[PDB]
Design a binder for this molecule. Structure first.
Ligand SMILES: *Cc1c(COP(=O)(O)O)cnc(C)c1O
Ligand SMILES: *Cc1c(COP(=O)(O)O)cnc(C)c1O
Lengths: 355, 355
């Protein structure tokens, strides 16, 4: 996975402090100031076990989405929520969509599930199409989708998601939607608002990217099925959410200006960054909707990750993602100054080269 | 599990802040001052993912035990290490000893293991005897022991552990030793020093009780089998140890006076506390070796946990531990002032009553 600055620094024989990381997609605003204050002023809570039931955290999450607290189960990162859903639903047959986030295949493999892959097509610009509907069959127990997709950044239109959601309902298939980056996309509500009466739908959320607290580990799962969620609480390990994460979560949801400030940055700097990248030669830039962009280098003989590492800039290589190949890379969208150094580095590598 | 002050407070209709908790066994010294300083001064590390490989943390743990770093895998609390060992060894048949720590049975059940229970006997003062040796058979894949035992506090003599360890070696049985509280016991090294050449032995450790950081969640597993430990690293969820826990761990191991100060407190206040309890009527006190004591109320009609809750003091009831019954309770050993309030409360409940 990206963000492994320590391993990148190790390969170069330097300290991770000298790397400009564009392989992790963390909100460049940093952790909310209020979250930092709360952590410093409540550090002493570390001396006691967290609330095994996470009452305050879950109340805050439920207030935030205006749903019953019984529908929510926080996790030690959304990563834990992915393993919890896999172990709790224990599918016999499940479908994933590739290119996509690798942890689903890992969690499903560990739970002993037959995995079917629906392949996105380069000829479709990696866009999810309605062709997937016919591929859904009664023997499938679960379908997992990433909305928006990692690494492409594409967000399937609500009508298509709704049609898949309805076909899953009729074929008794659980639909798991990974909304890790949904809060970066202006005015996108995701599916939490539609879970009442759609107990086959599961939504995964993360505070990692959006609130810039990847090191604390906090995510959550939301679903309206009483029995299934009761099962999820038993399947999850006790005390798995640390006390500081739970405190951070509660405080972060209280920042009323945070989202607007992110949308504004993404609309301004994010758009300028995307435009600048599209101006580079030998580079296809896919229209990502959140804080990262999938790139395809048109010269297969150019190792963009290696070239940028010489400049101490780390990008994500998508060479090993099923469905992609070595021409594919992913870069975060960060601050203007940081984005400028990445552009300068790419620009020097890509300009002056024949097709 | 104990330490659920929120749930206890909920049952009474009060705030957990008004309860004196003797149901969690946390070092009363609190978190090391150096750990608190380090956390405050490095809070910003939360903005990046932890090192997926935990190089610094594992180097510190390896330096501490003077063993190869390859033998260690930190966990999100020793609780995670218990689930990791269960899922990584995937035993078909395993033996546990009861009364004991409940998470082993839960982790084994989830991994689909046939569980055999070796029962400790009240007639033996709950002491582990050599009779267990004959109960070990070739069809067993694993044997799990708690050293010292939770909730009894008893530490099996090294010779008996060595004999069990050798019988497991000959019968190809993995021996897992839970040393969560071993550092509280003066001059007890545990088994880490003997793992070289004993790859069938696994040791679980926790920084939770000893360094008073239960809210941060940090424990670890140690074993000298190359392949098996490689498997454990794959079985464990990515980024499961949060960044602050990893930092705390490294700093805590640097406190050279911490252990002596704990042994001193335990030898002084701990002994005075144990003696005072033995003076109470209608109360059997087992000779615990760490920071907790198992109590047996001689009047079955006296609900000690309920009576103490009226005084806003929470103790652990061992009524639901397989092998024990409602006469059994467990109390932490804390500060002198705190211990005095517990004694006063017990003394008022127990004095003035006929046999
Ligand atoms: C980053 C990411 C995750 C995991 O997030 P954490 O909360 O840090 O574990 C899950 N899914 C997708 C699609 C992600 O990008
Ligand atoms: C407390 C305890 C654990 C778990 O400790 P954490 O590090 O907080 O998960 C495991 N085993 C025993 C015997 C314990 O007492």
């Amino acid at each position: 996975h990206g963000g492994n600055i320590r391993e990148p620094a190790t390969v170069l024989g330097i300290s991770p402090d000298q790397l400009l990381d564009f392989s992790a997609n963390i909100n460049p605003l940093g952790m909310p100031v209020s979250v930092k204050r709360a952590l410093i002023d409540n550090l002493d809570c570390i001396e006691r076990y967290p609330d095994a039931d996470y009452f305050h955290l879950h109340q805050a999450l439920a207030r935030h989405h205006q749903v019953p607290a019984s529908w929510i189960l926080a996790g030690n990162g959304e990563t834990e929520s992915i393993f919890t859903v896999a172990s709790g639903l224990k599918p016999r047959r499940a479908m994933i969509v590739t290119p996509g986030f690798a942890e689903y295949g890992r969690a499903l493999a560990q739970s002993g599930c037959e995995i079917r892959r629906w392949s996105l097509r380069e000829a479709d610009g990696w866009q999810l199409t309605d062709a997937i509907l016919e591929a859904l069959t009664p023997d499938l127990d679960c379908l997992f989708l990433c909305t928006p997709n990692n690494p492409t950044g594409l967000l399937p239109e609500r009508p298509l998601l709704q049609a898949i959601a309805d076909r899953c309902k009729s074929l008794n298939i659980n639909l798991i939607l990974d909304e890790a980056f949904i809060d970066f996309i202006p005015h996108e509500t995701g599916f939490i608002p539609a879970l009442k009466d759609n107990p086959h739908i599961w939504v995964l959320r993360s505070l990692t990217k959006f609130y810039a607290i990847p090191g604390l580990r906090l995510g959550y799962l939301v679903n309206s099925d009483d029995a299934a969620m009761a099962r999820m609480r038993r399947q999850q390990m006790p005390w798995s959410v640390n006390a500081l994460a739970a405190l951070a979560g509660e405080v972060a949801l209280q920042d009323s200006a945070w989202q607007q400030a992110t949308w504004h940055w993404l609309r301004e700097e994010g758009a300028r960054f995307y435009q600048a990248l599209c101006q580079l030669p030998l580079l296809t830039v896919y229209p990502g909707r959140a804080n990262y962009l999938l790139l395809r280098c048109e010269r297969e003989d150019i190792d963009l990750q290696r070239r940028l590492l010489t400049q101490r800039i780390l990008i994500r290589s998508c060479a090993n993602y099923p469905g992609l190949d070595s021409r594919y890379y992913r870069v975060a969208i960060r601050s203007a100054a940081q984005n400028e150094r990445l552009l300068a580095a790419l620009r020097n590598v890509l300009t002056g080269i024949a097709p």
